[PDB]
Every structure is written in C-alpha cells, then in structure tokens.
C-alpha cells in the first residue's frame, strides 16, 4: 500500500551533462585500452606472469567501453535498436563489469605471492594465471548474466521505447541488487585491502629508494579503487533499504537518493579509464616495452 513515488527528471541534468561525460569516458577508455592491447600484442620477448593479466583486464574494459554509446543515445532521446539489443547490451555490460573487478583481485593475489613469498612461490603464480583465471573470472561472470537474458526486454508506451530489466514484484530487484553489491564490492574489496595492506606493512620501514617508490604506488591503488567504487554502492544500499520500507523519510528523500545514484554511477564509470593509467603506464618496464613497440 501507501502512496506512489514517481520519478522526476531534469531536462538539462539528463540531456546535456550525462552525454558529455559518457562521450569523454568512451574516448579516453577506448584510446587507453587500445594502446595497452597493441603494446601487449606487438611485443615479441615473452609473456611475463603479469603481462597475461593486463590483457584480460584490457579486454574486459574494452567490452565495457563499447556499451557506452547505446546508453548515451538512450539517455538523449529514446531506444531505437529493437528488442534483441536490449538484451545483448545488458549481457555485455554485466560480463565486463564483473570480470573487470575480479581481475583486480587476481592481480592483487599475484603481487602478494610475488613479494611476500619470493624465494619459493614460482609455481603457484603460473598455475593461477594459466588455469584458475578462467574458472574464477569468466565463468562466474558468464553465469551471472542469466537474469539479463531473461528479465530484460524493451516495452512500448505511446511513441517512446524504454529498455530496462522488468521484474515481477519488488523482491526480485532487491535480491539482484544485494547480489550485485556482494559480488562487485565485498568479495574483491576484502582481498585487495587484505593483500596490499600487508604488502605496505613490509615495504615501509626500508630506506631504499625503490621500496619507498613502490609504497606510494600501492597506496594510490588502494585509495583509487575504493574512492571510485564506494559512493555508487552506498547509494545502491540506501536505495535497497528504502525498498524494504525500513527507511521512511517521505518521497523527496527517495528522489534525492535517486539523483545521487544517477550522478555517481557516471563517476563510477571512470574505472575503465583509470585502470590503464594505474596498471600499465605507471610502470617503468611497461614504459620501456611501449617505447620499444613504438618502433
């Protein structure tokens, strides 16, 4: 029961600002991921243990980036692409979003093994990056797109088409939002925060130049991940809470939190642009490889 809260959208905030951010992200991400893929593929020396992880992440980021023009077009006027693409777009978006966050957890495990256990851990890293990546990144991501195939389809009203996941009752929405947060933030967050913290606990007291240089980069990575992915999930959580009626603060509160989610999801989309800078172009070895591949 109770009254009904209907969404309200600003013309400018939905028509002029979001398309510009989407376009900027599209261009920057496609350029960065393209450069990383060409550098990784055109090198001839070998494929180091961490040169096999940059490629997975670049592929996932490229798949995510390809989705952006469709969302920009939808936000501008409406959906023109039919019913099949209203499923294909969601499938691609979900796969890329989940894989691009699980790959970070695997990279963190690789680094923790390669630093803390340096003398003896030469076999497990190879086993991980050659066999377990497919089991632990791509298989769950693919298996989590069944709801996209099932519950996503375009619907017609007047002369405007909307592409959205249509669910029968509120509970499906809450179940899938809780699954989304649990798989996208909690599972990789604890792994990253538990490995990098015990790395910087060991790289701190040394007076060498290289260790002091690597400490800053690790701290930058830890802060960047959470500062990019936290506000969106806070908004998702406080929306799922009000869908359960455990938060009752009127309707203007709901409109405000929806505006916050809409404005911060675009901010969270910058992961596909911040990943190549943080994981590829901040390394001396990769810089040398890129300079070699230029010629």
């Amino acid at each position, epitope marked *: *029961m*109770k*009254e*009904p*809260c*209907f*969404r*309200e*959208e*600003n*013309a400018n905030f*939905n*028509k002029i600002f979001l398309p510009t951010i989407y376009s900027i992200i599209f261009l920057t991400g496609i350029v960065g991921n393209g450069l990383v893929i060409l550098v990784m593929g055109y090198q001839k020396k070998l494929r180091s243990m961490t040169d096999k992880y940059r490629l997975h992440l670049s592929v996932a980021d490229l798949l995510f980036v390809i989705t952006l023009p469709f969302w920009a077009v939808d936000a501008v006027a409406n959906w023109y692409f039919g019913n099949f693409l209203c499923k294909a777009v969601h499938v691609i978006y979900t796969v890329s979003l989940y894989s691009s966050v699980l790959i970070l957890a695997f990279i963190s495990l690789d680094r923790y093994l390669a630093i803390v256990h340096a003398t003896n851990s030469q076999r497990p890293r190879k086993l991980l990056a050659e066999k377990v990546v497919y089991v632990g990144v791509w298989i769950p991501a693919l298996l989590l797109t069944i709801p996209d195939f099932i519950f996503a389809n375009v*619907s017609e*009203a*007047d*002369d*405007r088409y*909307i592409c*959205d*996941r*249509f*669910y*029968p*009752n*509120d509970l499906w*929405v809450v179940v899938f939002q809780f699954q989304h947060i649990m798989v996208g933030l909690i599972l990789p967050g604890i792994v990253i925060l538990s490995c990098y913290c015990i790395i910087i606990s060991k790289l701190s007291h040394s007076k060498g130049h290289q260790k002091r240089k690597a400490l800053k980069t690790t701290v930058i990575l830890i802060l960047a991940f959470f500062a990019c992915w936290l506000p969106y999930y806070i908004g998702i959580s406080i929306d799922s809470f009000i869908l359960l009626e455990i938060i009752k603060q009127g309707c203007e509160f709901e409109n405000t939190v929806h505006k916050w989610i809409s404005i911060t999801e675009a901010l969270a989309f910058f992961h596909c642009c911040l990943n190549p800078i943080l994981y590829a172009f901040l390394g001396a070895k990769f810089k040398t490889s890129a300079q070699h591949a230029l010629t």
Partner: antibody
Amino acid sequence: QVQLVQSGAEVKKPGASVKVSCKASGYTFTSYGISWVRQAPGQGIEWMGWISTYNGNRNYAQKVQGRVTMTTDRSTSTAYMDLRSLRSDDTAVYYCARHGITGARNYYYHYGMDVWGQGTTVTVSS
Amino acid sequence: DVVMTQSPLSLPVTLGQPASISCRSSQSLVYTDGNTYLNWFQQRPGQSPRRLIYKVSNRDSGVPDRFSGSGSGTDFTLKISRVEAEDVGFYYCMQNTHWPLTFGGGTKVEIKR
C-alpha cells in the same frame, strides 16, 4: 490482442457495496498500471483512482477517498475495484483503462490511457 | 487540481465544412523535461471513448487523417477538415502532466440541416 474485458450490468440497493473486474490480456501485465474512470449520465467524466499491478501502490481520488478500495490479481491477470456505501448519485458508467508505466528503475504516470476497456453500467435505486 | 474548460458546448456542422473545438487549461501544461501531454478523445454513442491524438499533435495509428491538432502553451484546440456522418458524438480533451488527470466538459457535434 491488447483488449480489456469488464463485468456485466448490475442493480443495487442504497448503502450496499459493489465490485467490478477488468480482465486484461494481450500484453505484459506487470509493466503498466490500471486507472478507473467513471462518467455520470449527462455530466463530465471524472477520475477515481490508480493501481500499479506491480508492488501494489494505489492512489485514490480526494472525493471518493475512504469509500473505495482497489486490488489486483497477478496470477489471473485481472484487476478489481471495490466501492461501498452507495448513494443515488453513484449511478454512472465505470471504465477501466491502462495508465502509466513501471519497471525496476523507470516509474512514471505521464503515459496515456490507451486500451480503454468497454465499461460497465452501475445503477442505485430503492 | 487543474480545471479545464472547453467551448462551444454545442456545435452544429454542415458537411464539407470545418469544425473547431477549443480547450484552454488553468495552468501551463509543460513538464520539467518539456513536452505537452494533452490528448483528445471521441466517444461515439453506445461505445467507449477512443483516443484520437496525443501529446497535442501526434495521431495514433488507425485514425483518419482528417483530425488534426496544433497549439501550445495554455491555449490550443482541435479542428476537423472534412466532416461526414461518422463524426457525430461527444469530444473531450484530457491533460496528463500533473497529478491527477482531468477531463473537459464535452462538446456535442450535431449535424446541421
């Protein structure tokens, strides 16, 4: 096809209660809402409510507030409209029309009343 | 809410001559995103109201091109180019931008003789 079918004509006594049904078909039921509209004989059309057919968020007209209740049956794909404490003024013809759009994230009410079921006649006399 | 009045209350017509029904709203029928959700209905006697045009100008499929709409702001109308025997019945205009929605008074289109 996208059509809406309603109940039959019925005669009642003052102070009684009535219920009419609007069985929809031909379209995905759980993506739109149903609005109930009446038209008194020789007087303008007027609105008395809305219902969601998805998490049941109903709203009622100010005048008919507290005298009418609406429920939907998602399993059988139909909507009801319960009215009680009838006067002689209630003699009219009640209509049923699809109204609004719903979804996980998109949820509006500015989408027009298109299907417009055939409507039933209701009379009250002693 | 928003009260809409439309005139004339009655309007006799001779065949082949235009007819004009006009309704103007109490407030400005513009939403935050723009557009103007006002639509016109025709109710031939012994039937249910049937949509003719929506959003002030667009016409839904299956309606004869004779009906046309124009105008904007808080003053606009509906006009029929050519009238035959199948244009007799009440006409209403409804706005759906504010909560709730409201219906016009209704104009009977009689046939002149």
